[PDB]
Design an enzyme around this catalytic site. Structure first.
Site, PDB file in Angstrom:
ATOM      1  CG  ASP A  82     -31.415  -1.197  38.167  1.00 21.80           C
ATOM      2  OD1 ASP A  82     -31.740  -0.490  37.170  1.00 21.80           O
ATOM      3  OD2 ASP A  82     -32.212  -1.593  39.048  1.00 21.80           O
ATOM      4  CG  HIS A  83     -32.065   2.768  38.959  1.00 17.87           C
ATOM      5  ND1 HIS A  83     -32.658   3.610  38.039  1.00 17.87           N
ATOM      6  CD2 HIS A  83     -32.980   1.806  39.233  1.00 17.87           C
ATOM      7  CE1 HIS A  83     -33.872   3.168  37.756  1.00 17.87           C
ATOM      8  NE2 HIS A  83     -34.093   2.074  38.467  1.00 17.87           N
ATOM      9  N   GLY A 181     -39.831  -1.275  36.710  1.00 20.91           N
ATOM     10  CA  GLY A 181     -40.890  -1.661  37.634  1.00 20.91           C
ATOM     11  C   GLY A 181     -42.240  -0.982  37.477  1.00 20.91           C
ATOM     12  CG  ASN A 218     -35.466  -3.004  34.774  1.00 25.54           C
ATOM     13  OD1 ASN A 218     -35.052  -3.641  33.825  1.00 25.54           O
ATOM     14  ND2 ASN A 218     -34.899  -1.880  35.157  1.00 25.54           N
ATOM     15  CG  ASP A 220     -35.620  -5.127  43.178  1.00 23.47           C
ATOM     16  OD1 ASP A 220     -35.987  -5.809  44.170  1.00 23.47           O
ATOM     17  OD2 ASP A 220     -34.589  -4.415  43.192  1.00 23.47           O
TER      18      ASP A 220
END
Ligand SMILES: [Zn+2]
Lengths: 288, 307
Positions: A82-83, A181, A218, A220
């Site tokens: 991710d990212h 998100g 996503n 988290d």
């Protein structure tokens, strides 16, 4: 089995459902997530940021993911960076055995986002590994041009009224879209037991977006909060307890309970057995 | 590299030091232990109870131990099953790749303990895996002559002895039998193990109680007593509650000083570091520091020749 993002999201796109992608940083988190996706027979994307990889010294998280893959052989599981910020971070992830990476260069001007993304795609596609990129309110023709110039398998787009924008981006690009998100239960519990959560914080909107082409959602913060609220509850209610299993276990179960409704809403329940998973080696053929 | 308990504790016994055996249940606890032993270049035993393996669905803990073995190639690391109760639990652990197992039948009469233990010793030694057994409870203190007979009849590689300790953080109301240790050691000729040996250090206990925990009467084994026992033949010292208290104390501190944090890494991280800091002076005291490079580790396959 280990699954590419391209195959997993292509299936979701074809059948109009979305797959939750859950950030994991340690054992109890992976266990909480897998209990939910296994219970609902749903594919899953486990994602790790460079920071999560640092936290686990890279190797511990690689090995925990191998554990999930072995314990639940029949669940398509995508391990995703991710990212990601650089080609170097992507190489590091692919070396750990990841099947997908995100190269996020969306804060750069268009041409530089394309340049950086293209380089990652060339490296990843040569190994069969999927690539997610981001373009940040997003003109659909700009999204189309970006995907054409880069060849990415998935595109995170700035979402938000204009749901036909999502639809249009999905139709023009022709590829799976990604949505990046805060339950009352979790929120209230954290404050009830000493926390001080921001006054920040809609599922229907996400469902709406999936129907138009969003295939990856996503998650988290929600899991982080579920675990924290559960530990705070044990600390207040039973202050004599000091065994970590006594509060991490309840935290692990809170994650699972928080995920079940989400996975049901995203629509991936029951789909784990829909397709034969293609290996990274066989996937190299998709890119010639 | 993966090391047998027989080799690791034989070196400890020859050189009069002790090796801490630390129970682990998850990633951060293993990371906390490994950072301390790696800093101190010491041997280490990572132990997993049957409860720990339940908590981790077995495979997650097997893989985290592999991660440790791979990350720190030059440290002798023994993976040991703590308090196994049956041959079935021992076969399960060995199948997971363990290099050592404890079969605890100490609650059974002598002859039955001997019988259950012999079954484990045959299966384990046939694969080069070490075996720890227990004679005495924890109150049945270990009788030196009986310990000599038990070892002769069982062939175990290490013997856990009962000298007054017990499991948990409330071992004493405010002592021990160390004279028996030397006698058992001399009579058996093998490495001895001391269970229930966390010390409940002051720093750790004060932190739990300062930040909302309720453990005002926690009391552990003084480190000086353990150091004395090591000098008389104790070679493996089991530590579990101290790590648990260290992690819990650190999390409580974050929860109070920074109530806004909710990402587990923000409190389990400090938890992991507290375990490491707590273990460093303990490892120094056991005397194992600087001994990780003393011997070439024998593989389980080569260890089969010992039996
Ligand atoms: Zn014990």
């Amino acid at each position: 089995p280990l699954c590419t993002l391209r195959q997993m999201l292509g299936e979701a796109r074809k059948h109009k459902y979305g797959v939750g992608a859950f950030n994991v940083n340690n054992m109890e988190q992976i266990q909480g997530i897998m209990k939910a996706v296994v219970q609902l027979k749903s594919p899953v994307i486990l994602q790790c940021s460079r920071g999560a990889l640092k936290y686990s010294d890279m190797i511990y998280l690689k090995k925990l993911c191998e554990a999930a893959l072995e314990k639940h052989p029949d669940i398509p599981i995508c391990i995703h960076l991710d990212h990601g910020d650089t080609l170097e971070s992507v190489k590091m992830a692919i070396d750990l055995g990841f099947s997908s990476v995100m190269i996020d260069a969306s804060h750069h001007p268009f041409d530089e986002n394309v340049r950086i993304t293209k380089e990652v795609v060339a490296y990843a596609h040569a190994r069969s590994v999927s690539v997610e990129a981001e373009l940040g309110l997003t003109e659909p023709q700009d999204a189309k041009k970006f995907v054409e110039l880069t060849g990415v398998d998935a595109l995170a787009v700035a979402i938000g009224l204009a749901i036909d924008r999502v639809k249009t981006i999905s139709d023009l690009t022709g590829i799976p879209l990604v949505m990046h998100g805060v339950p009352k239960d979790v929120k209230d519990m954290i404050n009830k037991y000493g926390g001080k959560m921001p006054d920040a914080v809609p599922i229907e909107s996400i469902v709406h977006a999936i129907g138009e082409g969003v295939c990856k959602i996503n998650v988290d913060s929600d899991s982080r909060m579920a675990m924290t609220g559960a530990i705070r509850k044990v600390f207040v209610e039973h202050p004599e307890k000091f065994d970590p299993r006594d509060y991490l276990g309840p935290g692990r179960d809170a994650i699972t309970e928080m995920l079940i409704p989400k996975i049901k809403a995203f629509g991936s329940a029951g789909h784990a057995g829909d397709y034969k998973v293609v290996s990274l080696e066989e996937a190299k053929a998709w890119y010639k």
